[PDB]
Amino acid sequence: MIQSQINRNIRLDLADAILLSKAKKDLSFAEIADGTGLAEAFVTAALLGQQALPADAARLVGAKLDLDEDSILLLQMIPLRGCIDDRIPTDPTMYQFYEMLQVYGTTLKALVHEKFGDGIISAINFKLDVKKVADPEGGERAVITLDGKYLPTKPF
Amino acid sequence: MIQSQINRNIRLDLADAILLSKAKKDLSFAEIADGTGLAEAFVTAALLGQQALPADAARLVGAKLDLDEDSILLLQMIPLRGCIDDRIPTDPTMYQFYEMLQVYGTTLKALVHEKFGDGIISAINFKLDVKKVADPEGGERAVITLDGKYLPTKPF
Amino acid sequence: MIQSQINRNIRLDLADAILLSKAKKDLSFAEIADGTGLAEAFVTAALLGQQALPADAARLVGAKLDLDEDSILLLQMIPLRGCIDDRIPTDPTMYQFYEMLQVYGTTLKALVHEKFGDGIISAINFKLDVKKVADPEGGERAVITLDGKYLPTKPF
Amino acid sequence: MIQSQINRNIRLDLADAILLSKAKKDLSFAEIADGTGLAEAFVTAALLGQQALPADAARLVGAKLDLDEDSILLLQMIPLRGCIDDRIPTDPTMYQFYEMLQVYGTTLKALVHEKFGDGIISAINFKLDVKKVADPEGGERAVITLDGKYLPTKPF
Amino acid sequence: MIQSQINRNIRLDLADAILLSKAKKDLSFAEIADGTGLAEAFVTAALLGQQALPADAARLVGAKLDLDEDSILLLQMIPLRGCIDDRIPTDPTMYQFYEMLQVYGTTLKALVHEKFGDGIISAINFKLDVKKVADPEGGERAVITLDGKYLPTKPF
Amino acid sequence: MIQSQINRNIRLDLADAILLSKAKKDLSFAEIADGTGLAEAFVTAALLGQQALPADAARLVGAKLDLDEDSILLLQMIPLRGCIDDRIPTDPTMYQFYEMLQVYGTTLKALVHEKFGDGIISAINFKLDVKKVADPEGGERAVITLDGKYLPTKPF
Amino acid sequence: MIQSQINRNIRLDLADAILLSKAKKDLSFAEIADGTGLAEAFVTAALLGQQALPADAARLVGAKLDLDEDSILLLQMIPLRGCIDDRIPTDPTMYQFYEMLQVYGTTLKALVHEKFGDGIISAINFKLDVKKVADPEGGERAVITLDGKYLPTKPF
Amino acid sequence: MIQSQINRNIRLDLADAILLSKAKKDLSFAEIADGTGLAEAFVTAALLGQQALPADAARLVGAKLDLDEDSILLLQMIPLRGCIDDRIPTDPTMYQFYEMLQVYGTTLKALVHEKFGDGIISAINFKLDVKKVADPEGGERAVITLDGKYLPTKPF
Amino acid sequence: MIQSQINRNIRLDLADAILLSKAKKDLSFAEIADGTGLAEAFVTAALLGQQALPADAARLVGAKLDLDEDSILLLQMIPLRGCIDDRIPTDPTMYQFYEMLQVYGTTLKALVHEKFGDGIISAINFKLDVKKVADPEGGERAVITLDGKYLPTKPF
Amino acid sequence: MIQSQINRNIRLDLADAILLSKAKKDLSFAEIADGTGLAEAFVTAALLGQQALPADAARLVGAKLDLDEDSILLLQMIPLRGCIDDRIPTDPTMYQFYEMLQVYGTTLKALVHEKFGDGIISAINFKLDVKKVADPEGGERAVITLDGKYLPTKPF
Ligand SMILES: [Cl-]
Ligand SMILES: [Cl-]
Ligand SMILES: [Cl-]
Ligand SMILES: [Cl-]
Ligand SMILES: [Cl-]
Ligand SMILES: [Cl-]
Ligand SMILES: [Cl-]
Ligand SMILES: [Cl-]
Ligand SMILES: [Cl-]
Ligand SMILES: [Cl-]
């Protein structure tokens, strides 16, 4: 039977315990996700309290991180989502994504309505991935792909 | 000589005027940008107060939209950027992008640090674009590509 | 060509002008929506700046309310939605609905996950209606039906 | 003698404990409420700290979940209600209901005054329920019924 | 047909104009409410944007204050209520009432539940009045009576 | 020698402990205050962290509730007052009193100035009480009397 | 008959006009308050929207500043007080007084309770003055005297 | 070597422990500061976490209050100052001082600039004291003296 | 006679007008400050509402910008300082300086106390400047120097 | 493998433990950073939870402070940065840096744009140092050098 959380702090406390174990074992998110059949972004989100793992995935990552039974069960709970402490991130790495919305948020709205129509690009019927690539000018770039379903707003 | 703004309301009020003109002329953002040599996302952002147009582009869009000279000059000013009225978007279309950050913000942080290192993906050395792709299961998806330079944080 | 707003105040100022005209003519929302082919809640939301009207509906309500051409045009624009002045309504009538969420929000989440699964009940693929019904015990009740699509959250 | 709470955290801490037991026992809210004579929404709300259980119902759910006496007592206290952590929900599932208010809030006000008069639709003399209905276009919808008494505002 | 507002600033701007007229005519709130058949507190609240006046009351106070027709019509509209600029009053006179709630709010909850039961004392089925009385120790006291219906919260 | 608090959490935590003891003993506020010589609203406010008990009353209520010596001493401290968790109450029972201020705050100011003069009605030289009165139309009403000294603001 | 305001912006807009006139005439606050028989701090506060002037003083300052009749009447109204734009001052001069409260607020509470007892030092039965005194170490000091009545909090 | 704090809670938690000890020993702030050679306002502020005590004063107060060594060392640390829990005080005693700034803040700014010039009255080069004086009309007054260095803002 | 502002919007509106004139005349801040004898940072801050210009400097920049007499007079007023719209900058250029504080704020506190002692580095007895320096690895750097007087916090 | 944090409190609690140990050993930040091969400002920021130490540096500071293995591992994790408790510092020492931004933030924007162009001065490609220098007029100054890369914002 599906189970869900209502207070984010239970899963966020579990996340901190996970990260400590992870650091002690010197593991990567890539290797934790290996063998689950699931995308690195999805598994990582789950570890960090923002997705639920199916039972087999939770047992696998639980074994890798030496997690107790309560914790393996908690990982399967549908979370009370919201990773930002207090609305606006303080961390520079997180903040930059917020700044992309402060600069381009209204452009995204405008071009979504022009290209698709009234409605939204879904954060639910949705996937994301992160790739590292050389910058032709030197250094490296991230190519982060947001891939969401268009859900129309129609009159009724 | 470069000119800059300090009160976003001057360019945001201009944005509303531009949008009224645009609607009266039944024009698209694609057609406004066509001929400037600049990407639609850039030109659109400038119209909406989040980027500066070079003089020629300002005159070109100014002609298309029947703008006055003060408006054409304002478009060339470096803006006081920030398109969200009060931190958290109210508009569903815009909010969904904020929700992507509430769900994946910490994952983005975690995977940036694993793939690149300490530091940030830049919103300055940065571009984005929006593409419509057919969803195999029916309907349409938006593929939004965030493309940002990695700037490392190193000891000194 | 579709047109969209980025500052809610343009359509909110239009809403106030609409309401003054409505009052001067002593019209009801029921009578304004009649003949549009659209639900009273949808048309009303449009007048109040929270939905877009198709052109024929915009011209029709514009005739009833004696709106100028710019106003008729504005009603067809995709709005920057968000009716609540500052996050939490101050008006008692509006506040009661927010209180429903303060008492039942987490119950809604839990029951949605149990009955449907991980994911959301959509406010986009969505309809609302308000019915007045006599209370068997004396007085009147409102039956407000929220009717939203289930969109699942699945691993990837 | 009736007993009441003044700090929501006592009952919200209990809720988390309840949710862990419920998960360990692989129980549903449906099952837990069955046998109490109380609506599933009402019982679930009580477990989640937003309603008080009558003594018999508290003892019944208490047995199912293996709760200690103090917990069974706490379930019977009139709660300090307010399930949302910090005014605006972060969780997508809960947020969609807030968005319904951001889109339709002023419409609900307007149509309530039109249909009933000045005053409110009550969140106190109030029932809600969640029903799953097949969507003719495929998949599933939730029909959530908010059923509140009209309380008039009259001159005095 | 009943008419309602959605932007408090319209009626609050009218309140400021009413107050200037009132001061120029050197009128009291008691004199303005006189003849109206309505309580001083109700009529005053209406002038200040927090109640609607019945048509005859509006015309009567409109005559006293020399209001134009748009204003007499506005006073009949159901308001978007909320007199506090930004949640917490700055004005010492208003603040003291908020302080009463900071000191006694939980006591009022506790004693309402003990004396009446679960539920609320209504701010809708509600009367307020202010009396001036001598303090037996010297000076003067306000006796402010909050008279609200008990609305029970009952299981379902 | 008088003793005072600077952090409300110490007395608020004691209040939760007091309420758990009260509930285990199935005691009422009326019976806890009875015998102290102090008004029920005052004693209740003390228990809930918003007033100081004199030593004898502290020992009396401490015997009734089986409190330890540090707790009995804490009850005698002048509190750091403020019962509302985060400025605006979330609990419907407490919120209704806030709403009375959102509706009637400016009216209270205006009528206080008219009847008394510039200055305040004091929340310090102040008492309150709650009386249950039959509603002639059916049910029960609370008459809550706020009784405060007028303190004038005069030129100097 | 006493008259009062409910929106601070009316008197704050007047204050700005007063300050421009004052600057054009190169007047001091000392000389504006001369002849009024009132303290410079009181009269100045009135000009800046935080006190009411008696009629004679209003006419006198109105003459000196070339104010129109509506402005002279406005100066006589009891204000909606609150001079800080958004709770915490931005201006360094004003912020230093707020910092004094951030450093010494709890000390003030503690020493007030010890020296006087439970209750408050009043901001209403109150005066303040600003004196310049030479610093023996070089330069100048301000000695700002806050003089307020002790109002006791007593059991009842 | 000088030592400093960055999280206020460590010293605030210590303050609470100090206050319990103080109350158990029935001590006054006056008695605790006696023999330190330092002003009671300064010593009190230190105990409450807003100043650092010199080693000899820390040891003297620590013996009076039976503090452990870690506590005596903590009192000598330079604090992370800020005594107000959340910007605006909730406590009536502390709030009245914030209200003096809401009423007179701008007047203080204006008179400081007139009497001294551009710049600030310092909260750093600063002392305060609280004196009790009889009120001729009956009762007691607090004369609180804020004594700060004028620091000019000069062009460069 | 020195004159001061209490509402920042007056000078911030003037700043907008100045910037439009500056842009029309294609002027730089460097050339506007030239001839004034005042640092570029100081003059610029004045134009932007954050400093007061001496009379001669006001007349000089006024001539360059073609300002009217009221504008020249406003530039000499001591401002109500505070350039950030709502506490945290939205603009990326301004935000980075805030971020410097989020990362290094506690380090600045710690090192200031170590190097100097208890107290502050002054924002009043303060200057700043911005220099451009070539980056040895390519591109350009800004070396921004914050130069503030140490003011000690001493016991009393 | 690189390891990162997502909850600032883990490292902030570590910071507090570090500062206790540091105080018990009577150590300076200068001495702690000595031998590390890294700048005092960088090492200090790491201790305070705002930077990551390389392994050797972490082991060395760990030896000087007698940290346990978990603590030495935590120091190597990339932090969830953000040292300010709640956006605006309450501590006077930290606040003054924020005030610098309230006075000069817009000037910094304007001058950055003029001297470099559109874009930012980076807080990432960035170093900071604090130098104590005698003031020629008497006393001491801090010279705080902010040294950041210019990152241009270019059209595309
Ligand atoms: Cl990925
Ligand atoms: Cl695009
Ligand atoms: Cl249900
Ligand atoms: Cl009355
Ligand atoms: Cl307390
Ligand atoms: Cl009572
Ligand atoms: Cl004075
Ligand atoms: Cl003192
Ligand atoms: Cl200003
Ligand atoms: Cl410079």
Side-chain angles (χ1 to χ4, degrees), chain I residues 5 8 11 49 79-80:
Chain I
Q5 289 284 115
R8 65 183 177 169
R11 283 289 290 280
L80 192 298

Side-chain angles (χ1 to χ4, degrees), chain D residues 1 3 7 70 81 87 156, chain F residues 16 22 26 86 90-91:
Chain D
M1 176 55 55
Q3 305 298 324
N7 162 23
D70 280 354
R81 297 173 166 99
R87 310 200 171 140
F156 57 94
Chain F
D16 295 337
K22 182 173 167 291
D26 199 33
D86 185 20
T90 62
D91 181 67

